[PDB]
Amino acid sequence: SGFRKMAFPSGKVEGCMVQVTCGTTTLNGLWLDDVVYCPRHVICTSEDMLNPNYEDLLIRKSNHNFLVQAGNVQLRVIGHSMQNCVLKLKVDTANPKTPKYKFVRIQPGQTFSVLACYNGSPSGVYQCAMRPNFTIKGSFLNGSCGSVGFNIDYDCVSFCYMHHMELPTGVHAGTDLEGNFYGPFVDRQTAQAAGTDTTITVNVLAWLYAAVINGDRWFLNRFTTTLNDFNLVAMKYNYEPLTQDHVDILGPLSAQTGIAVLDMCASLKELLQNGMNGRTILGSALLEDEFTPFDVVRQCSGVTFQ
Amino acid sequence: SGFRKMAFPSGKVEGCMVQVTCGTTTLNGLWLDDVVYCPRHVICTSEDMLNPNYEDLLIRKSNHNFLVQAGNVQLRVIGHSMQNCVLKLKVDTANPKTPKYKFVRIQPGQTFSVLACYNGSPSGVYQCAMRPNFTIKGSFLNGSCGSVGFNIDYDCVSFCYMHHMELPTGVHAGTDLEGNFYGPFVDRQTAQAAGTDTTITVNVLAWLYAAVINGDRWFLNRFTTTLNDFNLVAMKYNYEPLTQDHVDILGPLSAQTGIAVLDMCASLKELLQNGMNGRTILGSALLEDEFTPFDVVRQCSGVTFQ
């Protein structure tokens, strides 16, 4: 029993972090096989940031301008290239700690673990969600660039995020491991709009199910509702619309608790219209939306990983 | 920028988890050098739990009754002993992945990372605090026993907790790595009282400092207070008294923000007396007490570990 914001074990990713230096800038790289991946603005100076021409900036860098370093051992770059917003440094030594891995571009509302690193060295791990506006609410300081988000599927690490930049309200933007940004962001220091952040309704429902599984039942009411009627209310409190897929995804949690999804929607409806009047649910005084239905099943049934 | 409930990287602890089986029971062990550590009630059957006599139960176990297993490799027990509530299984193979480590008994209010495991395999990592009543609010299912809490100091893992048991309200009790319980709990299935849980005031203050460092300043008021006057109010909302030590510990956070501790106490005072009126602080609608001043410094300045 119990419910906690839980990250994946980070052992398999720790051995893949190196330190990348180009002239003055130092940040983190991801070393898999004989390739190191890092944000391409490592080739920028502070002034270049306002309006970088990456092609032109890259023209005047040779392999020997890139200092790659795994612990005290020192790797040498035999080739570099730009793939979108990431730089791929080809090195002379395949990582002997390369795990089984994939690169995946995740969808908004999915969650993942971030291993925050500085100078190629792990500092900490936490779980976060891709917000519907394609930002994340992370914890990143200067030097954290190149830190990666990941999931695990048994033995296979799925890399999905690389950290690049911060936006005014302490929210964070980055790319997938192919260098494509999530959202409309670009890697330069010029004013940029993030859209409105909405609440991931299906995640809220899964967390309400986790509450119930852990005996926190007071919000369970006696009403029901329809999917169209719920969405009419959710959309006014800035919530994602619920679809029949979402209902199907919640099936396992609905079947374990004996509470139908539409019944749960009616309880959520009331929580949005009346607030929570001072109680908490699973120790929280807000509705939590950074647990997917999979995260809840995994945590409330004990899925392990190699 | 940003503030997250952050766990230590778990790589160095993952390689120390094994699976321990005795007759019917299977749980987790901690394998360091040639010793495996596990909860001693692994030698119990479901019936023995109501009133185990561990000495007598242990009398009828020999080395070959204990199946220890690291992945697919299979270790053999050449000796067993009971140290308080833990069992120390002497094995024939020193763990080649033993990190530099210590055993520490932590004090209430300190935080640590838990690597929740099942069948000797890491499932996830999260951060928690030793509550003032010597429980933790974790996330543990059947099979999680033997999972360990730890901190890191650069290269040295400090093991501080081993999970044993759950109490009615989904709170958890366990031992240090020498087998002594935290709190007055004993390892048998008989009614047992946990005391009242109080709020760790110095942790709340450090989190308020983290708020301010991250620009969340609305609760900063124009009043001040005295340590005796604050404690008179804190003690009525079930808060730990603040001492001059606590003030000294907060010095680094006070110096970074320019807000004196007593001034911060006056803001906290008002938050306890008026509630937070609907806003949030660092995304939370409750006062958070599971960040030590050290956790805040570490996260808001970027301490890394080997």
Ligand SMILES: *[C@](O)(C(N)=O)[C@H](CC1CCC1)NC(=O)[C@@H]1[C@@H]2[C@H](CN1C(=O)[C@@H](NC(=O)NC(C)(C)C)C(C)(C)C)C2(C)C
């Ligand atoms: C990494 O590059 C690093 N070296 O660690 C760094 C990390 C961030 C998180 C704390 C600083 N990222 C940048 O410096 C990033 C690079 C320039 C400027 N960057 C920013 O994140 C800036 N944000 C910003 O300009 N935001 C908008 C575009 C105005 C919304 C900072 C002001 C935070 C430095 C580039 C290429 C975007």
Ligand SMILES: *[C@](O)(C(N)=O)[C@H](CC1CCC1)NC(=O)[C@@H]1[C@@H]2[C@H](CN1C(=O)[C@@H](NC(=O)NC(C)(C)C)C(C)(C)C)C2(C)C
């Ligand atoms: C571990 O032993 C395991 N094998 O994983 C197990 C983990 C807990 C967390 C989910 C079950 N612990 C126990 O089974 C533990 C062992 C018996 C009974 N235990 C309990 O935790 C019981 N709690 C309990 O009796 N609580 C009090 C004492 C009434 C407050 C359960 C009812 C949860 C099984 C012993 C030796 C205490």
